[PDB]
Amino acid sequence: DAPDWPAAFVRRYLDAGHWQDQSFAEALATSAARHPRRIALCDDDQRLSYADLLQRCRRLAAGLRQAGLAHGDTVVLHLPNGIAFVETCFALFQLGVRPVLALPAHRQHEISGFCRFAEAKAYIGAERIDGFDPRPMARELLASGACRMALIHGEAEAPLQALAPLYQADALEDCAARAEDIACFQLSGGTTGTPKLIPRRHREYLYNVRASAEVCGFDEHTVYLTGLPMAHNFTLCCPGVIGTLLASGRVVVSQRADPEHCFALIARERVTHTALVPPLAMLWLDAQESRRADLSSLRLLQVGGSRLGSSAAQRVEPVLGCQLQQVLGMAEGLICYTRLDDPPERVLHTQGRPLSPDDEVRVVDAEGREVGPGEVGELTVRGPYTIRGYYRLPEHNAKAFSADGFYRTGDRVSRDKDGYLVVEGRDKDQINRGGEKIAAEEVENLLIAHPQVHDATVVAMPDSLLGERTCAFVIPRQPAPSALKLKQYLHACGLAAFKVPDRIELVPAFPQTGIGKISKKDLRERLRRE
Ligand SMILES: N#Cc1ccc(C(=O)NS(=O)(=O)OC[C@H]2O[C@@H](n3cnc4c(N)ncnc43)[C@H](O)[C@@H]2O)c(O)c1
């Protein structure tokens, strides 16, 4: 069902001290006991101390148990960023009930799939999420038998049930979860959904949190803004919301990543840390009048999910006044971080080095040969917080994991002389133009350096004579440059002639994935049909 680490690995990871003997609920209880009255979590109106958060989680756990959720059950958790997300997560952790961590952007196709694949006892959602009313969907989940109950935070009508009254139960003090148990199902973030369920276990996911918190300098004075969906691995655990809580910092909830909102929130709450994907970082760097906000509290911006090119990376410290950290991560495991004392050569041009000393990285060619230093190949990895299989997916798992347990990421990377990863992109985003390979990131980074370019993305399109030609989609800043002007600019930059895009499309926006990454797959489909 959930392939485990072989015994030799379990022993090593315990011996090394990576895997400790606490579940998520116990870890939060321990943190809360260190600083019970300090504010742990705040939104626009509500501010919860560690002690009140813990008590609210224990009461909700009692109410969920009364509603029929039992140790070993699964639920689909589909909430917007907020206090209820945190409370519900940790209440389920306490009960040993596993949440599938659905994104706000997920809709009926995904949510129904998750409920059915996991045999979820409940859907837990809100009266509104990401501009969508999920309540008709939730009623259809019940009517079709996708789940047995549907709990809604907010107003709803029968046969949906209300989540808020379950907080009135007497606090449950016991914890049913074991450190070796599956704690939750993360979701894959590939380009061919429906997302796959990723079993994360308490002890390994907590190692992910603790090690990330140390690398990122989290401490008691960390004020973390949720700039991405809390359900996502980056926001939740790297070090994320849970890392902040376990460091006894304070989490500031936001349901929006636009700089007009977030910059005011940073000034009001004296935010110190956040994490974004590159398209959102570009919005923050290009914020106009909003930059009048007092951002002086900001200490660290993590950027990952997709590569932040050096042109944009170089602007972070001058414009925002904070340190940059680049992060390569995946919900399946491996995180790579640039370090807080790393020189600019690493921070501007790489996506970090592996989090754990026991992360085993192999970069291989199509034949499975390990490539030479600085050469590009497929990233494969095994380690102390990287899964050995997706949940209940033996057929796919036989293809996605090597015989010796390495996860095949589908990412193309090289490694520099110090072990830092440099991500070319996804395997499917490669470009072969008449036999000449083109690094899309090289061309994109040059375009993004242009003063009237906001963002740029380069994809392949079919061509009878060359097999593939290239098309750059470019979001301008006014006054917008023409395709011809950008081609002249790339020439002035020294770009090789065959790397200049055959076609340049000026557009207002790019199609995006669930947490805001650019969907190159959607752009290629748009070209293919045309
Ligand atoms: N801390 C942390 C953290 C950060 C991001 C994710 C995340 O993005 N998870 S993910 O499961 O949604 O997607 C994974 C896939 O994103 C791509 N990718 C991610 N970072 C990339 C980068 N800096 N440069 C280029 N590509 C990157 C790869 O293709 C990769 O396989 C996460 O889980 C944790």
Reply yes or no: is the peptide bond before residue 357 cis, omega within 30 of 0: no
Tell which residue, 211, 240, 207, has the closest CA to residue 101: 240
Method of determination? X-ray
Residue 47 phi, psi dihedral angles, 5° rounding: -135, 125
Other CB atoms within a 10 A radius of the CB of residue 395 amount to 7
Instruction: Tell me if 24 sits within 8 A of 93, measured CB to CB.
Output: yes
Identity of residue 233: N
46 CA to centre of ligand 1 in angstroms = 32
- Quick check: 384 and 394 in contact, CB under 8 A? no
Provide the residue type at 329 as one letter: G
Beta-strand relationship, 223-225 and 182-187: unpaired
Ligand 1 atom nearest to 515, measured from its CA: 12
Resolution in A: 1.7
d(CA 92, CA 67): 12
Residues 46, 39: Cα–Cα separation, whole Å: 10
Atom of ligand 1 nearest to the CA of 238: 1
d(CA 339, CA 220): 20
Tokens linked to 411: 């990412």
Looking up tokens 């956040």 gives: 274
Exposure string over 356-376, b if 16+ CB within 10 A, otherwise e: bebbbbbbbeeeeeebeeeeb
Residue with tokens 């509603």: 67
Q: Ligand 1 centre and the CA of 14: distance in Å? A: 27
- CB half-sphere exposure, 438, CA atoms < 13 A: 27
Classify residue 364 by its DSSP letter: E
Place of tokens 């410290």: 317
Could you tell me if 474 and 453 are in contact, meaning their C-beta atoms sit under 8 angstroms apart?
A: yes
Residue 240 CA: which ligand 1 atom is closest?
A: 1
Instruction: State the sign of the Cα–Cα–Cα–Cα dihedral 108, 111, 115, 116.
Output: positive
Angle at 109 between CA 108 and CA 114, to 5 degrees: 90
Identify which of 125, 97, 95 has the alpha carbon closest to the alpha carbon of residue 110.
Answer: 125
CA 411–ligand 1 middle distance (angstroms): 10
If 0-12 CB within 10 Å is exposed, 13-18 middle and 19+ buried, where does residue 243 land?
A: buried
Q: Quote the ligand 1 centre to 285 CA distance (angstroms).
A: 21
Burial of 417 (0-12, 13-18, 19+ CB in 10 A): exposed
Whether the Cβ atoms of residue 72 and residue 96 lie closer than 8 Å to each other: yes
SS3 169: coil
CA distance 241 to 330: 17
Q: Report which DSSP code applies to 150.
A: E
Question: Angle 405-198-423 (CA atoms, 0-180°, nearest 5)?
Answer: 70
Taking CA atoms only, the protein residue closest to ligand 1 atom 27 is: 306
Distance, CA of 231 to CA of 197 (rounded, Å): 13
Pairing of strands 453-463, 467-476: antiparallel
Instruction: Return the exposure string of 23-56: e unless at least 16 CB atoms fall within 10 Å of the residue's CB, then b.
Output: bbbbbbbebbeebeeebbbbbeeeebbbebbbbb
| Those residues with Cβ within 8 angstroms of residue 211's Cβ, 6 or more apart along the chain or in another chain | 18, 355, 356
Q: Which atom of ligand 1 is nearest to the CA of 187?
A: 11
Which of 328, 346, 422, 520 is the best mutation target for the ligand 1 pocket, counting ligand atoms within 8 Å of the beta carbon and taking the most?
328
In sequence order, which residues have a C-beta less than 8 Å from that of residue 121 and are 6 or more positions away? Answer: 68, 69, 70, 73, 74, 75, 97, 147, 148, 149
Tell me the CA–centroid distance for residue 264 and ligand 1, in Å: 28
Output b/e per residue, 266-298; b: 16+ Cβ within 10 A.
Answer: bbebebbbbbbbbbbbbbbbbbeebeebebeeb
CA of 305 to the centre of ligand 1 (A): 4
Q: Please, is 86 exposed, middle or buried when counting C-beta atoms within 10 Å of its C-beta (0-12, 13-18, 19+)?
A: buried
Location of structure tokens 């700089």: 259
- Written as six digits, the tokens of 202 are 């308490």
Closest of 422, 420, 326, 335 to residue 385, by C-alpha: 335
Number of H helices, E strands in the chain: 17, 25
Ligand 1 site residues, Cβ closer than 6 angstroms? 188-189, 233-234, 238, 304-307, 326-331, 335, 351, 409, 411, 423, 426
Q: Whose CA is nearest to atom 6 of ligand 1?
A: 329
Residue 306 Cα, ligand 1 centroid: separation in angstroms? 6
Q: Ligand 1 centre from 80 Cα, in Å? A: 21
